[PDB]
């Protein structure tokens, strides 16, 4: 039949155009099943091309299965089933076209899920990456140890021992790439019918994870000392998920008395565990870093989970999990797990820590965040006056703000979105399902220049002030 | 009670030395509950330190709950419950100290789970990372999209549109960081009671993944055309997990005949899906890259899953997943998922692809893997002669070798280990556990200079004792 070739410079190769055309004619039944195609030399002369082109085109059709060959004379069109001719679905629904990529500027964000990128020593970080690459060539092994590179885990071990008081062997550590991955892995090491208990309000993300994992999740109310031991002994769970260093999102710090109560509870009966979601303990502005709950544990019932998400690059995402011996044995009986963190990044982190650049970085950021947090609880107090109520300790990268307004939380979040302001509600942290109505205020990715404007935008959103045309 | 202080500091600061000592005395019950604590001035005069030091030390104790304060002053020791002192567990069991330095040298590897680190343009990778850094350094905090950065998803979309024929929108792509992570999310997007079906034999890791998710998994044995459309109709699953480009680990290529049958099968009933696991389709040595199964799908029932772990560095691990519209909707109804790939890693990959360095790398590696595979085949025919049977298409980074021997597979792996040869058996890829002994031969990490000895280290393990 008719085959037109394109002699263009940047067109597909000759042999490519040939089998593409033949694929089309076979799929459209123009070339009947089991019908003989011309010989290589015959079709070549007919298209005035090299026989090696027709051969390469045929071999392509042979390998894919459009043609089959018989030992003597000719190739034949393989018999292909006709398409089901069902209802063809439309292409790209408009509501899924929500991705309207445009411009992140000038948006002002009060998000708690990021970090400042302006004060990050990117030059020192790249020096650590180059140094690690020239010493660990060729990237040590090929991939990585399932728990992560040992030297990297041993580095993090020394760090959290000096800064958190966490006592563990590198063998106990597992990274990483977010707590969401480590949490999933942990739920499979814990008993299948283990009852989990979370703080209300708390981390909605872990709640969704535990619910989608088919695990029963209890909700434990908070008091002035944090997670209520009274409700824990009442509902009687198996595994606790707490944030004692800085409660998410209430902001309260669990005192040593309440910690000992929990530790004693976990020692009362076997198969009881406490999960430590430590995510911003390295940032305290009135006091030093508080020794984590795991540091006081003597029964190895505490699972410590740390992260570098808020401390390093915003998108880096590297977490770690410290497993007690009994859970480590459960992990080693697997052997099919793969490391989710880039081995090249791990080596960089090891060098960033060992060179002392990390702790040096934390010190500078802690002062920067300290200064950014007020001015912030000063513009809010200047704008809202007594209409704003600020809850939460003087630490971390977020605090709660309650407002006196008739508008709902949704109406506030809608106006802010229309004023190019990224803020998040407080009702989303309600696990079991007020009105304050409260908002979570982050200042990690917040620029110091956009502080006064952000508060002014926030005010209009709270009281629904219309724009003057 | 005395408190010794180092005033040279660092060491620790004075206020740090103070509250640490006070913590110890409160926990050791030496300072009784509700006992009066010396005033900030009193303790300062007594220790010859600044009041600001004692104040900083007291504040630390107040925040941690070691002390409590009264409005009319002063500070008192908080009533703390004693520890249980019940049963203390051991410290670091010797059998769990497996983390010893294992030397992979001088070991000849026939492992399939790798890619050559020595042939990767690491200098070119770093140059791309630096350009992507300086381009988005001021906007790194704003590029943390759950599905992955839009510009990155678009670049991968355009790539697989040309190399795989995959037709999709950037909206549908989901990065990433390993197919394992993507599979986990996929099981959550798919119906909770969906019956999965893998190939037999197949990728054992995805089997364990699905089983641990509490999902029902049926095994479909292969014929000459790959995954059996016959058993698919008989065992009637809801989701198919297939490797049509290059079957793992049998190595057969699913012909367009079988591909159409599977596609029509998915359209027979609503809520039927097919997971296409593409992992090495960019390495065909006889023909061009065979277009993906998703490229022929007209009913949006195929989930295409790609990865760079085999393309680039195995230590990198960047994957991607193209969702049909129905599944993307289920994803958007969640809104709590987070990206697992580094923002700087994504932007580096995008730069690596758009600069042409990726296509340049693939082209060089494809020829290198081609020449190495044939030399390995030639060496396998030198030894063994006809007693060896090489199975699998002329593509990818692995093939199967059947051996005509009366020695068990386990005993072959024993001697091979004894001859410092890293090799895996085909019995490990059986999902539901069942001669002649068969081995999987990966040549991605294998050096050309160790091919002859490697084959010589083989044979030996199969026949010699
Ligand atoms: Zn126990
Ligand atoms: Zn359907």
What HEC string does chain B produce?
CCCCCCCCCCCCCHHHHHHHHHHHHHHCCCCCCCCEECCHHHHHHHHCCCHHHHHHHHHHHHHHCCEEECCCCCEEECCCCCCCCCCCCCCCCHHHCCCCCCCCCCCEECCCCCCCCCCCCHHHHHHHHHHHHHHHHHHCCCCCCCCCCHHHHHHHHHHHHHHCCCCCCHHHEECCCCHHHHHHHHHHHCCCCCCEEEEECCCHHHHHHHHHCCCCEEEEEEECCEECHHHHHHHCCCEEEECCCCCCCCCCCCCHHHHHHHHHHHHHCCCCEEEEECCCCCCECCCCCCCCHHHCCCCCCEEEEEECCCCCCCCCCCEEEECCHHHHHHHHCCCCCCCCCCHHHHHHHHHHHHCCHHHHHHHHHHHHHHHHHHHHHHHHHHCCCCCEEEECCCECCEEEEEECCCCCHHHHHHHHHHCCEECEEHHHHCCCCCCCCEEEEECCCCCHHHHHHHHHHHHHHHHCC
Q: C-alpha angle with apex B256: B254 to B262, nearest 5 degrees?
A: 75
CB contact under 8 A, B126 and A133: yes
Q: Identify the structural domains of chain B with CATH numbers, from first to last.
A: 1-89 (1.10.10.10), 90-465 (3.40.640.10)
Q: Which residues of B touch A344 (CB under 8 A)?
A: 313, 315-316
Beta-sheet strand order (sheet of B388-391): B388-391, B398-403, B438-442, B424-425
- In the structure encoding, which two tokens stand for residue B302, read together? 């195929």
- In the structure encoding, which two tokens stand for residue B95, read together? 């059998």
- In the structure encoding, which two tokens stand for residue B21, read together? 């000592």
Pairing of strands B36-37, B388-391: unpaired
- In the structure encoding, which two tokens stand for residue A260, read together? 């000992």
Pairing of strands A438-442, B67-69: unpaired
Distance CA A390, CA A426 (A): 13
Q: What is the CA radius of gyration of chain A?
A: 30
CB contact under 8 A, A60 and B287: yes
Distance CA B275, CA B243 (A): 8
Distance to chain A for B383, nearest Cα, Å: 29
**Is the N-terminal amide bond of A176 cis, ω within 30° of 0?**
yes
Query: Cβ of A453: how many Cβ atoms within 10 Å?
Result: 15
Going from the Cα of B268 to the center of ligand 2, the distance in angstroms, rounded, reads 8
Distance CA B352, CA B313 (A): 13
CB B450 within 8 A of CB B404: no
Compute the residue count for chain B.
465
Going from the Cα of A269 to the center of ligand 1, the distance in angstroms, rounded, reads 7
CB contact under 8 A, B96 and A329: yes
**Dihedral sign (CA A392, A394, A398, A401):** positive
Distance CA B228, CA B222 (A): 5
CB contact under 8 A, B315 and A143: yes
**Gaps in chain A following residue numbers (C to N > 2.5 A):** 433
Report the structure determination method.
Answer: X-ray
Helix axis angle for B409-418 and B451-463, nearest 10°, is 130
Q: In 3D, which of B289, B278, B271 has the Cα closest to residue B320? A: B278
CB B170 within 8 A of CB B150: yes
Q: Which residues of B touch A229 (CB under 8 A)?
A: none
Distance to chain A for B381, nearest Cα, Å: 24
> For tokens 């809520």, what's the residue?
B271
Distance CA A333, CA B96 (A): 11
CB A70 within 8 A of CB A58: no
CB A428 within 8 A of CB A361: no
> For tokens 């071999």, what's the residue?
A59
Left, alpha or beta for A8 (phi > 0: left; psi -120 to 50: alpha)? beta
CB A205 within 8 A of CB A178: no
Going from the Cα of A240 to the center of ligand 1, the distance in angstroms, rounded, reads 13
Q: Give me the resolution in angstroms, 1 decimal.
A: 2.7
Q: Supply φ then ψ for residue B311, to 5 degrees.
A: -75, -50
Q: Best interface-test mutation with B: which of A114, A309, A342 has the largest number of B CBs within 10 A?
A: A342
CB B296 within 8 A of CB B261: no
Distance CA A185, CA A172 (A): 14
Helix axis angle for A451-462 and A409-418, nearest 10°, is 130
CB contact under 8 A, B344 and A315: yes
- In the structure encoding, which two tokens stand for residue B31, read together? 């300072």
Q: C-alpha angle with apex B243: B400 to B122, nearest 5 degrees?
A: 80
Q: Best interface-test mutation with B: which of A168, A248, A314 has the largest number of B CBs within 10 A?
A: A314
- In the structure encoding, which two tokens stand for residue A38, read together? 């011309």
Q: Which residues of B touch A253 (CB under 8 A)?
A: 63-64
Query: Between A143, A300, A328, which is nearest B96 by CB?
Result: A328
**Dihedral sign (CA B224, B226, B227, B233):** negative
CB A278 within 8 A of CB A306: yes
**Dihedral sign (CA A324, A329, A333, A339):** positive
Query: Cβ of B134: how many Cβ atoms within 10 Å?
Result: 10
């Amino acid at each position: 039949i008719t085959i037109t070739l394109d002699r263009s410079e940047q067109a597909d190769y000759i042999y490519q155009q040939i089998y593409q055309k033949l694929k089309k004619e076979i799929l459209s039944r123009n070339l009947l099943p089991h019908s003989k195609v011309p010989s290589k030399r015959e079709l070549a002369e007919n298209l005035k091309v090299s026989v090696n082109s027709v051969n390469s085109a045929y071999q392509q059709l042979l390998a894919e299965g459009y043609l089959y060959a018989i030992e003597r004379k000719g190739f034949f069109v393989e018999e292909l089933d006709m398409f089901s001719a069902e209802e063809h679905p439309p292409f790209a629904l408009p509501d899924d076209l929500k991705e309207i990529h445009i411009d992140q500027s000038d948006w002002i964000s009060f998000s708690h899920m990021s970090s400042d990128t302006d004060h990050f020593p990117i030059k020192s970080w790249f020096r650590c990456e180059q140094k690690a690459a020239s010493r660990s060539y060729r990237t040590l092994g090929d991939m990585s140890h399932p728990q992560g590179i040992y030297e990297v885990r041993a580095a993090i071990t020394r760090l959290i021992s000096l800064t958190r008081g966490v006592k563990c062997r590198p063998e106990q550590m597992i990274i990483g790439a977010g707590t969401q991955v480590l949490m999933q892995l942990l739920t499979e090491l814990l008993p299948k019918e283990a009852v989990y208990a979370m703080e209300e309000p708390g981390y909605r993300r872990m709640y969704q994870l535990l619910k989608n994992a088919g695990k029963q999740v209890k909700t434990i109310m908070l008091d002035e000392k944090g997670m209520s031991i009274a409700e824990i002994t009442r509902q009687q769970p198996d595994v606790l998920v707490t944030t004692p260093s800085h409660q998410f999102p209430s902001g309260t710090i669990m005192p040593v008395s309440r910690r000992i109560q929990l530790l004693n509870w976990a020692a009362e009966e076997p198969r009881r565990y406490i999960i430590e979601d430590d995510y911003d303990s390295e940032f305290t502005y009135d006091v030093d870093s508080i020794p984590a709950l795991q540091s006081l544990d003597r029964f190895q019932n505490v699972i410590y989970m740390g992260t570098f998400s808020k401390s390093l690059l915003p998108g880096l995402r590297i977490s770690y999990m410290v497993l007690p011996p009994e859970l480590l044995r459960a992990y080693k009986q697997r052997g099919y797990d793969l490391q989710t963190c880039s081995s090249l990044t791990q080596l960089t982190l090891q060098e960033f820590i060992e060179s002392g650049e990390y702790q040096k970085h934390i010190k500078k950021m802690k002062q920067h965040y300290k200064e950014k947090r007020e001015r912030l609880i000063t513009a809010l107090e200047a704008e809202f006056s007594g209409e704003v109520t600020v809850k939460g300790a003087n630490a971390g990268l977020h605090f709660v703000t309650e407002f006196d307004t008739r508008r709902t939380e949704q109406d506030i979040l809608s106006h802010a979105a229309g004023l190019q302001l990224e803020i998040f509600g407080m009702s989303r942290f309600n696990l079991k399902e007020t009105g304050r109505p409260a908002l979570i205020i982050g200042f990690a990715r917040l620029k110091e220049e956009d502080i006064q404007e952000g508060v002014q935008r926030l005010f209009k959103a709270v009281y629904g002030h219309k724009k003057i045309p």
